[PDB]
Every structure is written in structure tokens, then in C-alpha cells.
């Protein structure tokens, strides 16, 4: 391939009637930089026109649309697929070259494009057109399944996925996607050994993707109160063994190293974690996980001013306006002023899309409690804010009452609101103390403004 | 059928699952395994 690169830039500058020279240029460029492939196709489109005004074969045009698919040029990628299908139609008699099959994969690409338009209606149309004419194909059979997976798991999503194994049980991609469905059901955690054992046949092995999935379903077992019972210690070392195995078979996997750093961070080695995550950090920043795991270390050194910025940097993806666990992992030991009131604003943003959470309404009660005790104790503060303080702690007591009546918690019962209730009662006493001080500061500001009134009369 | 081998031959895969996990740079694991052994030196 490097010698191919050398010969290709031995001939690209040349022209011994170069025709396909750009075709086999870009034919290796698809692994490499895509823009080089674009440029090769660009003059390759021209070069088929001067010797004779010959229409570009649709395999070229489909592939350049395929390039623009991973680029921002989605619309003219669609135009490329349209004119590709037309040129295949212009290959009226070419069942030797099988323009029909080329149209099949072209339509597959165009349906994948309609998915990028989020035109899932026409994506459904193209997919069912292909499957009604070539039902032996699997990728269309499961992208349809993936589309309904975006709607949900127990749809015909899961059933297209299972029948994709029924048409092809040898198919590792679909078979992986079977257990990918089961990632939604984490209560089907220990059951995933079987549904990720089926193609641990060694024809499929080695499957890095699946064995990292084993490591991941093995790590979600952690953060339980049974580590002291050596159970999660064994789980940590078993995940470590998986990670050593994927380490030896691949040094350059990055999700592996994320897994090693995660399990050792669960082992309490957080100074020993930011380094290993730093490696995958330069390797590629575009892994959503490592953004979180680094800031967990930062807040473990209480480095909030290094952490929350990178949290909202993780929020710079076009995925979800209020991801819940990220603002949870944001509001952890947040103790300064913006770490209190803007913390409340973040909790309100989360609560706006997630008013169902008991933990979130507990945590807003907690942060309201913190800001209430921040304004009534050594304060000696404004009238209006301590007037808001009594209302906000009253609200906090409403949530203390409300959550305590609820049974289910985050597997830790929140009768801890009761000591908050004794607190807020003594906070009522303190507020009745300090509101008198508020009236005192009001009357003294009245007397000093009288004192300036008299002297300005004197002037 | 003939369509299956007819399509899977003529297309190409430049983007698979497995090399997503593998990093596009060169991040070896000796440094990783060295600190793996180093934490074992604390053990």
C-alpha cells in the first residue's frame, strides 16, 4: 500500500493518458484522507468526457456520494446517489456488470442517507423495496431494525434482529447487535454471558468488540456494597483479566485502556487513572466516556474548576440537551457560590425534562438547604434574600415530607429527610431571629437617610 | 443467491467495527502495562 502511494504520486503528476490513475488513487484513499479521494474523483469525472463525452459509470458516482456521506456534503451526496441510480438505469443491458446489484447497494447507501436526513419514511421505503426483491440481504434487514430500535427494544426491531440471525446465524454483526439490545435490560446482566457466548465459536473469535462488551457488562456489576465481601474484588480482577487479554491482542485499542483505568479507579487509584486516560485523551478526544471519567478524578481532587467545563464540553455533542447523569456527576462536591445557585439552575434544567426522579428532587432540597444555611447564620444580610430564604426552606420541607412518604428510593431509603426536618424547624427559629435583624437594618438605614437629608438641607 | 456474492464482492468495507476500538494514532500498551505492573508493585 505504501508502494501503491508512491506509484500513485509517481503517476498523478504525470499523464501518459491517465484515465483510471485517479480511480486507483482514490481506491486506496478511502482508508486514508477522504478529500484526496474527492479530488481524484473530481478530475476523474472530467477525464471521461474529453476523449469521448462518456457518462461517468455509476460506481464512481455512488462512491463519491458515499464519501460526502461522511462529509458535510449530504445534499449533493443525495444528488450523487440519484444520478447514480439513473446511470445504472442508463446501464440498460449490463447484467454482466449487474447494474441492478449496483442499484441495490446504491439504494442501500441512499436509505442510509435518508436516515441521515432522518427521512426514516423514505428509508423504510427503499429498505422494503430491496428486501422485497432481495430478502437474502441482512444489512437492510437490520438497519430497519436499528430504526425501530431508535423507537425501542421489544419492537420488530428485536425481531428483525433475531431473524437476521435466523437468515444468517453466522453473522457476527447482527449477533453482536442481539446482545446490544440486551444492554438496555441491565437486569439481564449475568444472562448476557450466554447471549455473548453463542458466537464465541473460534471462527468468529477473535471478536474484540464482543469481548470488550463482556468487559463492560462485567464492569457494570461494580460500585456495589459487596466489594468488601471480595466479590467485586474478584469482579475487578476478572475485568482486569479481560482487559489484559485485549491488551495483549491489541495494544492500540482505546476502549480497553478506558476499561483498565475505570477498574483501577474503582480500585481507588485516581492519581493512577488520569495518566492512563490522558493517553486515550490524545489518542482521540471524541470518546464521550473519557470526558466524564477525567472529571470524576478532578472532583476527587475537588478540582471543580477543571471538571465542570469539561462536563459541558461533553455537552457539546448533538445528543441530548439535558443528559441526566452528567449533571449528576457535575453536582458532586460543588461548594462555591456558582457551585450552589447555578448548581440549582442545572438541577432545574434536569428536573424540567426529568421531574420523575426522587433523587433529583432530594438534591434540589439539599442545595436549597445549603443556600438557606448560607444566608441566615453569620448573616447579617439583605432583607429580600432572607425573605426568599423562608419560602425556599418551606419548599424544601415540602419535598422532605413528600419524598419520605414515597417508598422506593435509589436502593437507599431517604428517611434522612427527617433530620433535615429538625434542621429546617430550627432554621425557622433562626429565621424568626434574623428577620428582626432585617427590620433593624431597615430602621437604621431610614435614620441614616434622615441624617443625610438634614445635612443636605444645611448645604 | 447470486445477488449476495454479486454485491459483497464488488463493494468494499473501509470502516468496520474493530478498528473503531483501535486508535488511529499509535498508542502502545507497554506504558499501560508498565503502570499495570507498577500498581502491582504497590500490591
Amino acid at each position: 500500500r505504501d508502494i501503491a502511494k508512491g506509484h500513485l504520486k509517481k503517476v498523478t503528476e504525470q499523464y501518459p493518458d491517465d484515465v483510471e490513475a485517479w480511480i486507483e488513487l482514490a481506491q486506496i484513499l478511502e482508508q486514508t484522507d477522504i478529500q484526496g479521494a474527492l479530488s481524484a474523483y473530481g478530475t476523474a469525472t472530467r477525464i471521461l468526457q474529453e476523449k469521448v463525452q462518456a457518462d461517468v459509470p455509476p460506481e464512481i458516482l455512488n462512491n463519491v456520494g458515499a464519501l460526502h456521506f461522511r462529509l458535510g456534503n449530504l445534499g449533493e451526496a443525495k444528488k450523487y446517489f440519484l444520478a447514480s441510480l439513473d446511470r445504472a438505469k442508463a446501464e440498460a443491458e449490463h447484467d454482466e456488470h449487474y447494474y441492478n446489484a449496483i442499484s441495490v447497494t446504491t439504494s442501500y447507501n441512499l436509505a442510509r442517507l435518508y436516515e441521515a436526513m432522518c427521512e426514516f419514511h423514505e428509508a423504510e421505503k427503499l429498505y422494503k423495496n430491496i428486501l422485497r426483491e432481495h430478502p437474502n440481504y441482512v444489512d437492510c434487514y437490520l438497519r430497519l431494525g436499528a430504526m425501530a430500535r431508535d423507537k425501542g427494544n421489544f419492537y420488530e426491531a428485536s425481531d428483525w434482529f433475531k431473524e437476521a440471525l435466523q437468515i444468517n446465524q453466522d453473522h457476527p454483526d447482527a449477533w453482536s447487535l442481539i446482545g446490544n439490545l440486551h444492554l438496555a435490560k441491565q437486569e439481564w446482566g449475568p444472562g448476557q454471558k450466554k447471549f455473548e457466548r453463542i458466537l464465541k465459536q473460534p471462527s468468529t473469535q477473535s471478536d474484540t468488540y464482543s469481548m470488550l462488551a463482556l468487559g463492560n457488562v462485567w464492569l457494570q456489576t461494580l460500585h456495589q456494597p459487596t466489594r468488601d465481601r471480595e466479590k467485586e474484588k474478584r469482579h475487578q480482577d476478572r475485568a482486569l483479566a479481560i482487559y489484559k487479554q485485549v491488551l495483549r491482542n491489541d495494544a492500540k485499542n482505546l476502549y480497553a485502556a478506558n476499561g483498565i483505568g475505570a477498574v483501577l479507579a474503582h480500585k481507588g487509584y485516581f492519581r493512577e487513572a488520569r495518566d492512563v486516560f490522558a493517553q486515550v485523551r490524545e489518542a482521540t478526544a471524541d470518546i464521550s466516556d473519557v470526558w466524564l471519567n477525567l472529571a470524576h478524578i478532578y472532583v476527587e481532587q475537588k478540582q471543580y474548576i477543571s471538571a465542570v467545563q469539561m462536563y459541558e464540553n461533553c455537552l457539546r455533542k448533538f445528543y441530548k440537551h439535558q443528559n441526566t447523569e452528567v449533571v449528576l456527576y457535575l453536582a458532586r462536591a460543588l461548594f462555591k457560590c456558582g457551585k450552589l445557585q447555578e448548581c440549582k439552575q442545572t438541577l432545574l434544567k434536569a428536573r424540567h425534562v426529568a421531574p420523575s426522579d426522587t433523587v433529583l428532587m432530594f438534591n434540589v432540597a439539599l442545595v436549597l438547604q445549603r443556600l438557606a444555611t448560607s444566608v441566615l447564620k453569620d448573616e447579617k444580610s439583605n432583607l429580600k434574600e432572607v425573605l426568599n430564604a423562608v419560602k425556599e426552606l418551606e419548599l424544601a420541607h415540602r419535598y422532605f415530607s413528600y419524598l419520605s412518604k414515597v417508598g422506593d428510593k435509589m436502593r437507599f431509603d431517604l428517611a434522612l429527610a427527617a433530620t433535615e426536618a429538625r434542621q429546617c424547624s430550627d432554621l425557622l427559629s433562626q429565621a424568626q431571629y434574623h428577620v428582626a435583624r432585617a427590620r433593624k437594618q431597615d430602621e437604621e438605614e431610614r435614620e441614616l437617610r434622615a441624617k443625610q437629608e438634614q445635612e443636605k438641607e444645611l448645604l | 443467491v447470486d445477488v449476495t456474492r454479486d454485491i459483497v464482492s464488488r463493494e468494499r468495507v473501509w470502516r468496520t467495527r474493530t478498528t473503531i476500538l483501535q486508535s488511529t494514532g499509535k498508542n502502545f500498551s507497554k506504558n499501560i502495562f508498565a503502570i499495570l505492573q507498577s500498581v502491582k508493585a504497590r500490591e
Binding site: N62, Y108, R143, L219, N258 | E11
Partner: peptide, 25 residues
């Protein structure tokens, strides 16, 4: 205050799905 905010802190790890690059004839 007396204790920090509660969380089920986990160093989770996500997986990319299958890419399905548009094909190259």
C-alpha cells in the same frame, strides 16, 4: 453540608455501534 451530594458514582464505559459506512464499489 454535613455530607456531600449523593450519587451512584460509576466509571462507566460505552461502546460505539456498528458504523455501516456507505459501500464502495
Amino acid at each position: 453540608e454535613r455530607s456531600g451530594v449523593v450519587c451512584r458514582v460509576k466509571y462507566c464505559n460505552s461502546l460505539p455501534d456498528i458504523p455501516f459506512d456507505p459501500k464502495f464499489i
